[PDB]
DNA sequence: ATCGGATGTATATATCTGACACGTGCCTGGAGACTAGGGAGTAATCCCCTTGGCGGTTAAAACGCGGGGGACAGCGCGTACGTGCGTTTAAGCGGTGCTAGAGCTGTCTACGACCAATTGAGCGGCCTCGGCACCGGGATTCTCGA
DNA sequence: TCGAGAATCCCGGTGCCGAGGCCGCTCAATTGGTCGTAGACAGCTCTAGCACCGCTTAAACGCACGTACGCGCTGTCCCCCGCGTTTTAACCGCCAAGGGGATTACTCCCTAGTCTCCAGGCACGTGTCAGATATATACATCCGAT
């Protein structure tokens, strides 16, 4: 018959068969249900869509058209919940948010 | 062989200026070299443990990444 | 001349704007190799291994200095002192 | 010798979100490491969810519970919504 | 111990051979040795050391008690309530004081509300008796143990249900002649804390006293019967399997006749209608009344689970509030002064009748008693009696000790103008004396009929000279009809057996 | 009269009394306490309880039960890197 | 003239007393009502065990005792002896719980 | 033939066979080697012996003869290495080490 | 329904070290939880050591490396000594 | 405060340039079809253990009060650190060259999964006494006015 | 100023309930086989890591100096501690009902495994423009004179 990928018939962009192979060959459990990789692939695609949208906005603010890790650092550390998720993660070549304490400014 | 003196005074002041420190005392430097040496001892101990387990003699980037993940300081950017 | 506390703030703006490393390469590489001598003799480092160690060490010291700055402002000063760093490592659990 | 990654898939999602924006190689490696990290977190949490109840099969139920355990607040609701939409479209097809 | 074991079997083996069928039915120590030995081989004048007169049936009740002591066995004085079980108990102790000439260490146990009632009638009848009411804090019990209890300077100690637990270690050290327990309902369980302490004291006899027998099961009565004579029975599963719960498999009701025959030389129970002593019985109604229009919404706001966002984990209890009164749910009460008007009877169901009933009874010169299961409901009735300006007293759990005593005699005062008298069920009506009233109302029902039967006979006893008219209030088409019908199922399984043992 | 509606005033976070917080501070080694520690400590304790009870309710709902057992709380505490020994 | 102590002696005696013993320090029924009130927001009609409430109480008391130790270190560092709300805010800011 | 337990072969006291079962049915890897459970049982026996020895000495320091959990708390927190290992673990019914700060003592 | 534990083995080790000191029930539960905790830590580290090198078998060598990754200081040295002595005795017997 | 006065910072223009986006050939891992068997879903049953409320005791919380010890603001002072200039020195860039070791492939072979028969180690249940928990008396220790 | 009232520690007595120890059952560990295959090992390749050299120049080092912040000292004031008295709700026991956790039996359907086929993804060339960088120019920005 005519072949058709599971990523196509589920309406996703991330692969599904690769995630299914990584669940079986990773020794997470003995048997893997046939609805697990669709759900997991949708979750990973959603998180990647969030971070790429925020990093694209941060790159558009500095009038660049490609994404450098500084933009990823800004897009993660400005969000509340993404900073809560990636709370103990060092992004390489990242840099620090601009932050000067109030009592150090001249008066 | 006094290679810890390679972490010079202007480098520590640049690291403090990125942190937000406006004014620095003169006894920060020895304490900072001690803190840096302790942190490097822990991470390189774990990385050499991984390298000796793999029966190699070359410390890859992946071993440093695995050691930093082992201690809790996850690093994104150097493969995996 | 400028007054004390102006060039400091301008350097804070400069070094928080940028992204690159702040410790020179070869002293840090000599330091990493000297610490690695104590564990297994005659090792061999890839370049990205030393780059990973330098990136993580800079992130660690920047986080430590931010917490030290918070403690030193809490004690109604503007000048950090070694007892601030000892407190900041005492709270985090590195004792 | 080949080494697999998530490069082309992140590139597809980027072309859906921002149609006129590229991405450098270091940011591509960071997004690759991010995808692998979140995958390992969710898979490990669902694995010991299946072990804690003496089951032997990761269903979609354990993945939903692991997503509700890990992702904080407003991300959890949209993640559960996206996953339920994907599985519902997949089953009827 | 072993001589009395034969002396117990002097009268047990004088009965039928079911006792031979019970001793040899173990699954047995040297009782079989003294069993096979015997298997092969008064005061009817109302004695006037008391201060007053006895009753001619009570003289028979006294002589049954000395017959148990003459045979050196225990027993149960299970006469119907209101017949004067205290006078039979006091005169039995004065029998040992003036005939057998032994004033000994006696220990009686009562509920807390009835502790003054013993020491009043001891002083009314036998004033030669040294008696306590062991009240007080840890500071006040510190003297009375040290001063007079350890000095052995007493006759009768009147304690309560919880003080006998708090002070077990200064009471093991003194031997006893009797442990006379009024209101034998706390000992209905075998694993209870109070029963575990009572089986450690040293006693000659134990005149266990109750107004009612078993409440729910056969399992309840033997647990009372186990701590009567544990040398004899000492059985849990064997007695349950001997009788098998009123022939639950065969439905014969001819094994029950042996059970009436076991207890008939082992218990005394006489009926208030049999021996009159008031010459006038009681009536009873059940005012099946409907729900008010406000709580019809509140009955809908529970079952559909709509007021909201709270716990409803026991719907049997949550509906039981709304069947009684709406103002218990914290939000039925509308205002910031929570108001004050005729709205209160207007919102409740039973208060519509009770406002009408008391105005029918305040004219007639009646005195009512109001009972309840919930303490917080009597607070609402307290504001209602202030609203109609009625005099009362309110006895409740954890009021005080001496405040209870004052409020009884204020209501039992002659020509007292107190009209209603608020009581609870598990604390108020369990042995107090309220002959000055005539009619009794129950605001709600209970999961035990014998708890309410203990409370209905409060005013219907010796000394009452009026017609007792009991008015139960039941909410129509609600949980109370299910509870009252479930309680009635518990009643016929008991009383139709207790009807037979006195007759045969 | 008007005694029937006089006690609705608990607000169960106020059930963590002032001498209880002082007993906790005396175990912690604190000599002398300010007067504003109490509201802040109640807020901290409420946030901690919200996190742990959220995770325990999630573990309870996944097993299709309605009874939050002790192992659910121990799993929720291990989940946040606060291991509790002594309950299985 | 009665025998009053100077302010601070009873405090140190209580410090030794409560650092010697190991019982719980919050009364059980208010803590249980607190747990049930917080749990009403996540799923209605739950039903706890007793050992679950004991586990939550042990964990919460251990958390608050460690918090007051770190708060005492901060307030001694600021050359005081009095813990203040900014000390607790600092000690939770350094740990990474903001 | 005659059976003999593997713990008596290794001379240990912990069960080797139960550790082998918990590693096979724990889903840690596909195949479990024969030398792993002996080694793991020996390491667990060593750590148990260390904590019980320190708790026995701490119990003897109070003239007690049975180990209450306060003794385990003292024996863990007074050691340095066991404190570094069990640094996150809260022991139930434990208590705190007796430690008053220096400046709070009276002059 | 039975429920296994480590209680009698802990009790045997207690009778080896201190021949007279007893132990309570709550302390026995604490030691049981300790043994399960250290078991899970060492087994997890050994498992992902085997996964990093693309092996498939947990030998004794991965357990030795997991002990040298987890236990600090002199505990690592003494634990490696005890384990190597145990396996060396086991192979010859 | 303001005004010039240096001064650092940002902006617009023009020019390379190497990293990125894109097209191709190949190959291995994903999809389709099929079969077997064992996890798990559901029904039904038992009984433990949870909830709600009252009774009664009493220990702890609340409240008011006096008073002293610490928090805080201000003053002064003195020395330590920021700033800038001139001199040294070592990092950085490129360039070459060597070779040690990571990495792949092929080939046995010891070894761990799987499975059937057998049986004692461990577990639940049930007695039982001794260590720990008070209990009260007596000696010692500590802080507070002297 | 040493004595004086209160707390703590310790000693002997009592008692009580929970750990220690037997006992019977049974199921999971052991033993003895078979077999497919992950890993050990030997060998070859090729690439990236080491070491050295020379040139340049940006950055570190050292020094002076001026000022502003750390630190100590005083005074005031008011907030928390100690304590006694009264209220209130926690604690434990008791009494009901019943809901839901835990178990067992049975059937079924969903996933592991196998074989076959084929296209999506990856390594490999290649054009080409986004951004780095020099270079001139406009504009906020701190600061001494006034
Ligand atoms: N011989 C008697 N003469 C008068 N009153 C009596 C007599 N015997 C008993 N009573 C009445 O009985 C009341 C107490 O009886 P009580 O012991 O409460 O009976 P019960 O315990 O069966 O309810 C007293 O008020 C007393 O007046
Ligand atoms: F026990 Be009687 F009804 F006072
Ligand atoms: Mg009576």
PDB file of C-alpha atoms in Angstrom, chain E residues 35-206:
ATOM      1  CA  UNK E  35     -17.030 -30.010  88.256  1.00  0.00           C
ATOM      2  CA  UNK E  36     -16.978 -33.811  88.436  1.00  0.00           C
ATOM      3  CA  UNK E  37     -16.992 -33.760  92.253  1.00  0.00           C
ATOM      4  CA  UNK E  38     -20.387 -32.064  92.572  1.00  0.00           C
ATOM      5  CA  UNK E  39     -21.661 -33.789  89.414  1.00  0.00           C
ATOM      6  CA  UNK E  40     -21.213 -37.125  91.209  1.00  0.00           C
ATOM      7  CA  UNK E  41     -21.874 -36.054  94.819  1.00  0.00           C
ATOM      8  CA  UNK E  42     -35.051 -13.869 103.989  1.00  0.00           C
ATOM      9  CA  UNK E  43     -35.523 -10.268 105.178  1.00  0.00           C
ATOM     10  CA  UNK E  44     -39.014  -9.554 103.897  1.00  0.00           C
ATOM     11  CA  UNK E  45     -40.120  -6.820 106.295  1.00  0.00           C
ATOM     12  CA  UNK E  46     -38.679  -3.521 104.861  1.00  0.00           C
ATOM     13  CA  UNK E  47     -35.955  -3.110 107.524  1.00  0.00           C
ATOM     14  CA  UNK E  48     -36.063   0.285 109.203  1.00  0.00           C
ATOM     15  CA  UNK E  49     -32.399   1.164 109.501  1.00  0.00           C
ATOM     16  CA  UNK E  50     -33.181   3.190 106.362  1.00  0.00           C
ATOM     17  CA  UNK E  51     -34.892   6.576 106.703  1.00  0.00           C
ATOM     18  CA  UNK E  52     -38.299   6.155 105.085  1.00  0.00           C
ATOM     19  CA  UNK E  53     -40.165   3.212 103.573  1.00  0.00           C
ATOM     20  CA  UNK E  54     -39.409   0.681 100.872  1.00  0.00           C
ATOM     21  CA  UNK E  55     -41.793  -0.578  98.199  1.00  0.00           C
ATOM     22  CA  UNK E  56     -43.175  -4.147  98.316  1.00  0.00           C
ATOM     23  CA  UNK E  57     -41.763  -5.101  94.932  1.00  0.00           C
ATOM     24  CA  UNK E  58     -38.455  -3.462  95.871  1.00  0.00           C
ATOM     25  CA  UNK E  59     -38.258  -5.752  98.914  1.00  0.00           C
ATOM     26  CA  UNK E  60     -38.266  -8.636  96.438  1.00  0.00           C
ATOM     27  CA  UNK E  61     -35.593  -6.740  94.518  1.00  0.00           C
ATOM     28  CA  UNK E  62     -33.441  -6.435  97.638  1.00  0.00           C
ATOM     29  CA  UNK E  63     -33.839 -10.125  98.447  1.00  0.00           C
ATOM     30  CA  UNK E  64     -32.671 -11.109  94.972  1.00  0.00           C
ATOM     31  CA  UNK E  65     -29.471  -9.159  95.607  1.00  0.00           C
ATOM     32  CA  UNK E  66     -28.682 -10.812  98.935  1.00  0.00           C
ATOM     33  CA  UNK E  67     -29.448 -14.142  97.261  1.00  0.00           C
ATOM     34  CA  UNK E  68     -26.633 -13.439  94.800  1.00  0.00           C
ATOM     35  CA  UNK E  69     -24.308 -12.604  97.686  1.00  0.00           C
ATOM     36  CA  UNK E  70     -25.449 -15.667  99.641  1.00  0.00           C
ATOM     37  CA  UNK E  71     -24.585 -17.765  96.588  1.00  0.00           C
ATOM     38  CA  UNK E  72     -21.461 -15.594  96.007  1.00  0.00           C
ATOM     39  CA  UNK E  73     -22.126 -14.752  92.352  1.00  0.00           C
ATOM     40  CA  UNK E  74     -22.576 -11.511  90.427  1.00  0.00           C
ATOM     41  CA  UNK E  75     -25.715 -10.237  88.718  1.00  0.00           C
ATOM     42  CA  UNK E  76     -27.404  -7.428  86.824  1.00  0.00           C
ATOM     43  CA  UNK E  77     -30.094  -5.182  88.306  1.00  0.00           C
ATOM     44  CA  UNK E  78     -31.703  -4.524  84.928  1.00  0.00           C
ATOM     45  CA  UNK E  79     -35.037  -3.161  86.146  1.00  0.00           C
ATOM     46  CA  UNK E  80     -36.859  -0.608  84.016  1.00  0.00           C
ATOM     47  CA  UNK E  81     -35.800   2.987  84.634  1.00  0.00           C
ATOM     48  CA  UNK E  82     -37.654   5.285  87.013  1.00  0.00           C
ATOM     49  CA  UNK E  83     -38.456   2.468  89.439  1.00  0.00           C
ATOM     50  CA  UNK E  84     -35.905   3.470  92.076  1.00  0.00           C
ATOM     51  CA  UNK E  85     -32.811   1.365  91.478  1.00  0.00           C
ATOM     52  CA  UNK E  86     -30.817   3.601  93.818  1.00  0.00           C
ATOM     53  CA  UNK E  87     -32.911   2.720  96.882  1.00  0.00           C
ATOM     54  CA  UNK E  88     -32.406  -0.983  96.240  1.00  0.00           C
ATOM     55  CA  UNK E  89     -28.660  -0.425  95.966  1.00  0.00           C
ATOM     56  CA  UNK E  90     -28.250   1.732  99.086  1.00  0.00           C
ATOM     57  CA  UNK E  91     -30.342  -0.544 101.309  1.00  0.00           C
ATOM     58  CA  UNK E  92     -28.287  -3.490 100.069  1.00  0.00           C
ATOM     59  CA  UNK E  93     -25.190  -1.725 101.360  1.00  0.00           C
ATOM     60  CA  UNK E  94     -26.880  -0.969 104.675  1.00  0.00           C
ATOM     61  CA  UNK E  95     -27.719  -4.665 104.799  1.00  0.00           C
ATOM     62  CA  UNK E  96     -23.987  -5.328 104.942  1.00  0.00           C
ATOM     63  CA  UNK E  97     -23.602  -2.469 107.426  1.00  0.00           C
ATOM     64  CA  UNK E  98     -26.243  -3.546 109.942  1.00  0.00           C
ATOM     65  CA  UNK E  99     -26.927  -7.261 109.324  1.00  0.00           C
ATOM     66  CA  UNK E 100     -23.620  -8.639 108.068  1.00  0.00           C
ATOM     67  CA  UNK E 101     -21.906  -5.770 109.965  1.00  0.00           C
ATOM     68  CA  UNK E 102     -19.303  -5.079 107.269  1.00  0.00           C
ATOM     69  CA  UNK E 103     -18.815  -1.435 106.308  1.00  0.00           C
ATOM     70  CA  UNK E 104     -16.232  -2.003 103.621  1.00  0.00           C
ATOM     71  CA  UNK E 105     -14.498  -0.186 100.795  1.00  0.00           C
ATOM     72  CA  UNK E 106     -17.281   0.445  98.274  1.00  0.00           C
ATOM     73  CA  UNK E 107     -16.736   1.996  94.846  1.00  0.00           C
ATOM     74  CA  UNK E 108     -19.623   3.199  92.710  1.00  0.00           C
ATOM     75  CA  UNK E 109     -19.326   4.618  89.207  1.00  0.00           C
ATOM     76  CA  UNK E 110     -21.869   6.865  87.551  1.00  0.00           C
ATOM     77  CA  UNK E 111     -22.105   9.423  84.746  1.00  0.00           C
ATOM     78  CA  UNK E 112     -20.905  12.890  85.655  1.00  0.00           C
ATOM     79  CA  UNK E 113     -24.311  14.569  85.785  1.00  0.00           C
ATOM     80  CA  UNK E 114     -25.630  12.097  88.372  1.00  0.00           C
ATOM     81  CA  UNK E 115     -22.848  12.234  90.948  1.00  0.00           C
ATOM     82  CA  UNK E 116     -24.655  14.490  93.407  1.00  0.00           C
ATOM     83  CA  UNK E 117     -27.825  12.386  93.119  1.00  0.00           C
ATOM     84  CA  UNK E 118     -26.140   9.437  94.835  1.00  0.00           C
ATOM     85  CA  UNK E 119     -24.776  11.404  97.790  1.00  0.00           C
ATOM     86  CA  UNK E 120     -28.095  13.190  98.314  1.00  0.00           C
ATOM     87  CA  UNK E 121     -30.055   9.963  98.617  1.00  0.00           C
ATOM     88  CA  UNK E 122     -27.401   8.308 100.767  1.00  0.00           C
ATOM     89  CA  UNK E 123     -27.799  11.217 103.186  1.00  0.00           C
ATOM     90  CA  UNK E 124     -31.577  10.992 102.758  1.00  0.00           C
ATOM     91  CA  UNK E 125     -31.704   7.292 103.638  1.00  0.00           C
ATOM     92  CA  UNK E 126     -28.575   5.978 105.419  1.00  0.00           C
ATOM     93  CA  UNK E 127     -26.853   9.008 107.004  1.00  0.00           C
ATOM     94  CA  UNK E 128     -24.255   6.828 108.785  1.00  0.00           C
ATOM     95  CA  UNK E 129     -22.223   6.427 105.580  1.00  0.00           C
ATOM     96  CA  UNK E 130     -18.988   8.289 104.821  1.00  0.00           C
ATOM     97  CA  UNK E 131     -19.196   9.277 101.150  1.00  0.00           C
ATOM     98  CA  UNK E 132     -17.306  11.412  98.643  1.00  0.00           C
ATOM     99  CA  UNK E 133     -17.959  13.012  95.337  1.00  0.00           C
ATOM    100  CA  UNK E 134     -14.415  12.823  93.993  1.00  0.00           C
ATOM    101  CA  UNK E 135     -14.451  16.008  91.899  1.00  0.00           C
ATOM    102  CA  UNK E 136     -11.781  18.527  91.153  1.00  0.00           C
ATOM    103  CA  UNK E 137      -8.634  19.250  89.215  1.00  0.00           C
ATOM    104  CA  UNK E 138      -5.249  17.580  89.552  1.00  0.00           C
ATOM    105  CA  UNK E 139      -4.677  19.938  92.469  1.00  0.00           C
ATOM    106  CA  UNK E 140      -7.970  19.118  94.181  1.00  0.00           C
ATOM    107  CA  UNK E 141      -7.679  15.370  93.663  1.00  0.00           C
ATOM    108  CA  UNK E 142      -4.189  15.561  95.178  1.00  0.00           C
ATOM    109  CA  UNK E 143      -5.536  16.093  98.696  1.00  0.00           C
ATOM    110  CA  UNK E 144      -8.467  13.666  98.640  1.00  0.00           C
ATOM    111  CA  UNK E 145      -6.265  10.756  97.608  1.00  0.00           C
ATOM    112  CA  UNK E 146      -3.586  11.706 100.136  1.00  0.00           C
ATOM    113  CA  UNK E 147      -5.785  12.911 103.000  1.00  0.00           C
ATOM    114  CA  UNK E 148      -8.779  10.598 103.200  1.00  0.00           C
ATOM    115  CA  UNK E 149      -8.436   7.860 100.573  1.00  0.00           C
ATOM    116  CA  UNK E 150      -4.997   6.648 101.635  1.00  0.00           C
ATOM    117  CA  UNK E 151      -5.942   7.092 105.295  1.00  0.00           C
ATOM    118  CA  UNK E 152      -8.841   4.599 104.851  1.00  0.00           C
ATOM    119  CA  UNK E 153     -11.396   6.999 106.320  1.00  0.00           C
ATOM    120  CA  UNK E 154     -14.446   6.354 104.171  1.00  0.00           C
ATOM    121  CA  UNK E 155     -17.183   3.958 103.138  1.00  0.00           C
ATOM    122  CA  UNK E 156     -18.356   4.872  99.619  1.00  0.00           C
ATOM    123  CA  UNK E 157     -16.415   6.556  96.814  1.00  0.00           C
ATOM    124  CA  UNK E 158     -18.501   8.088  94.026  1.00  0.00           C
ATOM    125  CA  UNK E 159     -16.352   8.508  90.908  1.00  0.00           C
ATOM    126  CA  UNK E 160     -17.085   9.056  87.224  1.00  0.00           C
ATOM    127  CA  UNK E 161     -16.229   7.547  83.847  1.00  0.00           C
ATOM    128  CA  UNK E 162     -13.095   9.571  83.139  1.00  0.00           C
ATOM    129  CA  UNK E 163     -11.751  10.095  86.662  1.00  0.00           C
ATOM    130  CA  UNK E 164     -11.592   6.305  87.021  1.00  0.00           C
ATOM    131  CA  UNK E 165      -9.174   6.321  84.069  1.00  0.00           C
ATOM    132  CA  UNK E 166      -7.072   9.272  85.239  1.00  0.00           C
ATOM    133  CA  UNK E 167      -6.670   7.831  88.739  1.00  0.00           C
ATOM    134  CA  UNK E 168      -6.228   4.109  88.152  1.00  0.00           C
ATOM    135  CA  UNK E 169      -2.839   3.879  89.895  1.00  0.00           C
ATOM    136  CA  UNK E 170      -4.033   5.192  93.310  1.00  0.00           C
ATOM    137  CA  UNK E 171      -7.019   2.825  93.057  1.00  0.00           C
ATOM    138  CA  UNK E 172      -5.379  -0.501  92.224  1.00  0.00           C
ATOM    139  CA  UNK E 173      -3.748  -0.379  95.656  1.00  0.00           C
ATOM    140  CA  UNK E 174      -7.040  -0.689  97.583  1.00  0.00           C
ATOM    141  CA  UNK E 175      -9.088  -3.877  97.567  1.00  0.00           C
ATOM    142  CA  UNK E 176     -12.838  -3.641  97.131  1.00  0.00           C
ATOM    143  CA  UNK E 177     -16.022  -5.412  98.131  1.00  0.00           C
ATOM    144  CA  UNK E 178     -18.226  -4.090  95.316  1.00  0.00           C
ATOM    145  CA  UNK E 179     -17.894  -2.180  92.060  1.00  0.00           C
ATOM    146  CA  UNK E 180     -21.425  -0.888  91.487  1.00  0.00           C
ATOM    147  CA  UNK E 181     -21.678   0.540  87.977  1.00  0.00           C
ATOM    148  CA  UNK E 182     -24.751   2.572  87.131  1.00  0.00           C
ATOM    149  CA  UNK E 183     -25.628   3.110  83.438  1.00  0.00           C
ATOM    150  CA  UNK E 184     -23.994  -0.031  82.060  1.00  0.00           C
ATOM    151  CA  UNK E 185     -23.648   1.203  78.495  1.00  0.00           C
ATOM    152  CA  UNK E 186     -20.018   2.317  78.399  1.00  0.00           C
ATOM    153  CA  UNK E 187     -18.985  -1.324  78.901  1.00  0.00           C
ATOM    154  CA  UNK E 188     -20.860  -2.408  75.764  1.00  0.00           C
ATOM    155  CA  UNK E 189     -17.505  -2.701  73.984  1.00  0.00           C
ATOM    156  CA  UNK E 190     -14.790  -5.159  74.954  1.00  0.00           C
ATOM    157  CA  UNK E 191     -11.820  -3.243  73.508  1.00  0.00           C
ATOM    158  CA  UNK E 192     -12.750   0.087  75.095  1.00  0.00           C
ATOM    159  CA  UNK E 193     -10.325   1.833  77.417  1.00  0.00           C
ATOM    160  CA  UNK E 194     -12.722   1.902  80.366  1.00  0.00           C
ATOM    161  CA  UNK E 195     -13.423  -1.834  80.186  1.00  0.00           C
ATOM    162  CA  UNK E 196      -9.690  -2.560  80.032  1.00  0.00           C
ATOM    163  CA  UNK E 197      -9.167  -0.767  83.355  1.00  0.00           C
ATOM    164  CA  UNK E 198     -12.148  -2.287  85.196  1.00  0.00           C
ATOM    165  CA  UNK E 199     -10.854  -5.813  84.547  1.00  0.00           C
ATOM    166  CA  UNK E 200      -7.743  -5.060  86.613  1.00  0.00           C
ATOM    167  CA  UNK E 201      -9.263  -4.093  89.976  1.00  0.00           C
ATOM    168  CA  UNK E 202      -9.971  -6.555  92.790  1.00  0.00           C
ATOM    169  CA  UNK E 203     -13.622  -7.095  93.683  1.00  0.00           C
ATOM    170  CA  UNK E 204     -15.801  -9.553  95.549  1.00  0.00           C
ATOM    171  CA  UNK E 205     -19.070  -8.899  93.713  1.00  0.00           C
ATOM    172  CA  UNK E 206     -20.094  -6.521  90.920  1.00  0.00           C
TER     173      UNK E 206
END
